[model samples]
Target: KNNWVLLSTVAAVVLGITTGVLVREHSNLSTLEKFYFAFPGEILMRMLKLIILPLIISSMITGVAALDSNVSGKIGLRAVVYYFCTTLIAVILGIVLVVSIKPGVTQKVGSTVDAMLDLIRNMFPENLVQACFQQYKTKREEEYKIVGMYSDGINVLGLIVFCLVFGLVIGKMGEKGQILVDFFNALSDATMKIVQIIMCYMPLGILFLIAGKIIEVEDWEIFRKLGLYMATVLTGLAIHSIVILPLIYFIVVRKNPFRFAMGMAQALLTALMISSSSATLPVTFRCAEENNQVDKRITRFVLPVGATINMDGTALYEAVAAVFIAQLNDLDLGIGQIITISITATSASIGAAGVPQAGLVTMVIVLSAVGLPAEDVTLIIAVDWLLDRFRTMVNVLGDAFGTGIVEKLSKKELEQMDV
Candidate 1:
């Protein structure tokens, strides 16, 4: 079964490349043509997402229920503290990496207001009906439309606030919670079953998305121009993926990081290709459970939450992007501003829901917090699509590492050892 899965993955990759090249050669491809080719992947992703919210609520309830009530409170505190600690560290690391590389110096100053306008437009819903009216009506856009018409972007902070409250309430209710828990458990199972059914068509989705990504690579030379920026993001991602995460696994968990790392490569690769954590959640859950020996309750809860909130890679990118713009404008940042950048970047990363252009929105938030004009955002937008794939993989890696670290600590506590 493993060998067959491997074979199928390789086949999908090759198929994607061939299709991408063929599509790229046809430069006159219409929007509908592109959609025709891309819809399968999008559809699969949607199907997976259809299961996401219910799965998250259900699995979190289960994970919470499995613990002693006392331990449950401790779990809440520990989970928040752990998530905050690692995510903040990620943000700071991102700032330092971007500052060291100075990725923004390459771009010419004074692009135009149009660039900034577009980014601002993305932050809040400009036209609810119009935005959702587009083919992609993102998760945020959908939410924004629902909670009264407003130009403001879906309140990401609000959604999170609600989810956390809901989870806690369910956790506190015990027996009453069990009723909802049973329903959610059944829902999670149904979701997984749906995912399993969806997997049969994943090859087609992978093929199309990969092909589309290749076709979209407009300039081999643009890589040359933004090479430093690209290198900074990718290198920071590598360090986090290889060194930082593994160290946490080893030192904190005292587990064999190698096996977990090995097991995660396929899921990581899928995340890198698709650049969507929500799409990759099912596979990530499977690997964490099967190979890493992580509890399904923990895996299901942590993985989905991580997908929604944790974004080490996006944090890194925002820092790089902010610094890049600062350098381009020849502006000197003060200590206070840098500190603000760190805080805002961390919060923005955590607040970002699973969306394709979420990093851009987060970048704007960071920039605005630091009093930088957001007009320079377009400088990075063109390159963001390509870089996002790598950033997303890094995000998933961080998420998995968090689960491993948390599980390890939880086990130690159970064994009556100090964490």
Candidate 2:
């Protein structure tokens, strides 16, 4: 029960894949049976979601409050700049690769002005409480009846903004802030305990999730149809993860990227298996501190923020996906439309949670931004799980890389000041 969790998870993945393939080929399960098989995994994902908000809120508050004001400001500025620049480059690389390859042209598959407006409106909530309870509206006497409720889909960006402000305020209160800081520190610990408990069930959950996916695929031929598109995406990801990110690290820090990658093998491997940056955060944090020798302050602050906002891989995936879908439908995207996609992809990636398939959700926002049909997402949904693992590894790597870079830069600044 204690150390068997990792082995169990690995075994579950292998067994689940085997069972899924066998079931897809031989066993004829009814829809109800398939759903029953999948229910555990669905519930597991929901359970993870249940803890995400409190975990993020507590961690963010504690992370920010623990920092010295001056140091925090410098680190924050540098981290934000680094995140924005890397994510921009990632999206641009994705665009260049997808366009050059034109992988979706052979496929035949297939939103507007209102979509952009509605997306903007829905993104920011005017009243936070109302936003949480908006789904509880009911009709009564030609008026809407409201009940206290919360949404399954939390407003991550809004929550992050609120946490940042609250943290800064707490930091400013001097001795009085210590009480809130202590409370949140305890809360963060408790939340991590809850996450550990949930992780014990992860193997079974993953098994069912994979099984359900295989069962849902009515025709295996879809894989063949989308093979070229898959290659294009994989190619882009390889270049970004292998070539582009490494070049940046080498240029900035004068370190070997392969050595860094080797150091982060554990975190990257966990991310690949779970296909979630958030789920892999604890491991990423451990690797950053122990393996890469990142400073505690930098890892604590940058990693949490990076996990929430730094989604270079996801941004790239969304850009490629949006363009791929456009190509398949034979839609001609001009330079303006492509630029719109790059901007939207980068913006939408911020505040995207580091969970499995979270990118797919935000991919819809990217698609809508460029007037692409959201339904076309189905064309690539089958392979999303597979691609998610690769992309998630890159996301985790980016976070670790950014933390290391920021830590080095911060150390240099402190040294200069001391001198």
Candidate 3:
């Protein structure tokens, strides 16, 4: 009965959809009216985003710092490799299905080298404070010249990498470091306290957000026209999340995966509603530790990092979108183009990191690699939000499943710890 909050949230979603469709058909509301209606949602997102950085920083530092390398090396290594394979499989599964089915335009800006170099620079954020406020990007300084620059967004990828190493160093410090590690643990617990507060506001925020978008999206013609494109991406996401990820978990853990997933249902619902994996991190952590009985040491370490680095859904969606756009242009993708798409798509998803609605932005790199028109990305903008929610949901699911597997494998090690 105490978990009725989650039940209410699901009720909010169904109510939002129906009310959105009903009011959209009846109101013919103005833009300002729609914005006013959704203001609560704006508040919800603001609170969620506020809690994210602290949760990630504290959780990561504490979790990794707790484990000795003997254990961290084995568990962390397993999770990382598992992350890579699922993303790779998602990309390949997407490619194979495109030959099985096909369907968008997008324009490009910076060179692929610029994008690659920018990502590398972010990983070594010397001005670590700035990394909290900005991400590196390449800018068109002049009509004839482009320049590398910083953008107004969190460099989530950099922050994650920094915390991972910082925590590892503390872990290696023995009793001298325990003081520092305990502070982070307290910080992590406090952040979770805040996340619980924010979650109480979720249903109201989600209701308005979806309702407003329903009002704002004035046309469905584009959605219908891009039916095949949407189908391919959705199908690819479904296969990876429901089929491949579950299968991998079952094979590794020798148990029913969906039963494991049910524990994280609230987190997945939050991912679907919010469309940002980081925003859903709080709930994912709660579900994994409380409901699934995953070791906190593993959930804390695995999930925050996984949200940044493991992006199986994104890999699949980008691959499918890249190919669908090519089909639209009647461009014949040679073997070279196809292989580059596979590589870029896989890499770009990890590049997406903490940004909400990141698929459109990251798709730029995939398009650039294949010589596709980046402006054509607008072709799918109408439906990208819908796809984003699903993909983000899968990303959260991927992280959850990976955490369970890692926990199961590392249980003996976990049992050894007196903490």
Candidate 4:
């Protein structure tokens, strides 16, 4: 079942290129005619964009409420801070890596730090209904003074922040929150089912997406930069997982536990082979508790939920791609884009795995957040499954390391509890 999808995507890629090459010289079609060619691929994007909206909101809402449910009390707050900060660091690194690697020389916010007022204004949406159509942007068009201007697309960041508050307080609401919690889960459920349906259609999507986009441009060489972009993303994933994660543990927890890596050795390998954080849950539970010798309470508490919440590489991967695509197409990115991509990427992955195709569709959210077009994702999509394996390992490791960190950080709390 797993392997079939793998080859099918690749097969689709090969077919997409072959079809594009043969038809390119023969058909001198108009732009409108090309749109007709690309519509099949366009539907792929539409379906992904379709599911992505409800998926992040429902996933975050339901996840936050429930993670707080075990009456986690102190630890849940720390976990939130940890998830946010750790993922923040991961995104920054990935962001920095791509820029330095010169993956694409495409670039800037010239904000003179007049952002505080706008932030509060944005954090509280004026008309959330209108937020879907026009977002308020702080355009400093008149020198040092900031001019507030209305812009296009949904107010993604503002709306998501609004949902975070809704979810967090819903967690505090206890029993009353369960109704909305179940409702959001139903939304999440529908989104995931669509993901399953979406995956089956992916090869077709890729076929036309690749072929369709090619026919639109009639340019065969745009795929040229795929190697550097791939390498840039993969390098960041390696650093975050291999060096930076253990470094965080080293500095914070003050443990050189080379053996800690050994403890979760089986789980890491399982994630590598299976390429799934959700699927690797049982293996994480077994190896984490027995070999790592973390408290069983911590094991049960963090492992499953962390699968949904924590993914170092997933966010980093998207953050890199957000800019990478911008550069590839020579779009000028501003300072707002850098920070916006960071926030959107972190939020998307936190609302991670329950939606089935985590990395694929979520990339759409990040790209939209940064104002990158959806078609830009097609090249990234082609090579993504290969890189997907590496990121999934980082994801699982994020879960493992987070457990140990939470285990020790909340030591006295867990110790006093009755299991």
Instruction: Name the runs in model 4 displaced over 4 angstroms.
Output: 1-71, 106-225, 354-357, 417-419
User: lDDT winner among the candidates?
Assistant: 3
Better of 2 and 3 by TM-score: 3
Q: lDDT of each prediction vs. the true structure?
A: 0.68, 0.75, 0.83, 0.68
TM-score of each model, paired residue for residue: 0.82, 0.80, 0.94, 0.56
TM-score of 2: 0.80
Query: In model 1, which residue pairs have backbone atoms overlapping below 3 Å?
Result: 104-324, 124-153
What local lDDT does model 1 show for residue 155? Answer: 33
Residue-wise C-alpha lDDT for candidate 4, range 1-419, written one tens digit per residue:
44554467667778887887778788787878777886787776656545545655665576556545444656666666777877998899998998889776632110313333454566577887876446666656642665787766445456556776677789789787689878986886676666667667767866776666455452322345455777788899888877888887776687775668766765665455345566555456556766678865455445555666778878888788778777876566778667888887887776445222458767766777666666767766555545776788888888888878876787776556464
Sort order, TM-score high to low: 3, 1, 2, 4
Worst 10 residues of 2 by lDDT: 133-142
Candidate 1 structure quality by residue, lDDT tens digits, 155-238: 332333344456667767878767876776787677767666766777777888787666664675447766677888788887
TM-score leader: 3
The sequence of per-residue lDDT tens digits that candidate 3 reaches over residues 1-419 is: 46787798899999888877899777777778888888988898888888878988898898888788778888788888888888899999999888677553332120677777778888887699998888888755564686676778788888888998998999999988889988998899888888778878889988887776666565564466666677788888888888888999998798789998888888999888788998778888877887888788888888987898898788998888888877777677888888989998888987886567888888888998888778978777877678888899899999999888887787788888784
lDDT of 2 by residue, 1-419 (tens): 44575567668878887888888779788878988888887887667667766766786787777665676789899999999988999999999999998888866752233324433443466676654323221122325442333344555555556677778789888898799998988887787778677767777887887767667655555467677777777888899889988887887787777888878866786676567787677667655666778666567678877886888878888888889888877688997898899988887777355657877767777888777767768877777778888889888999989976886677765454341
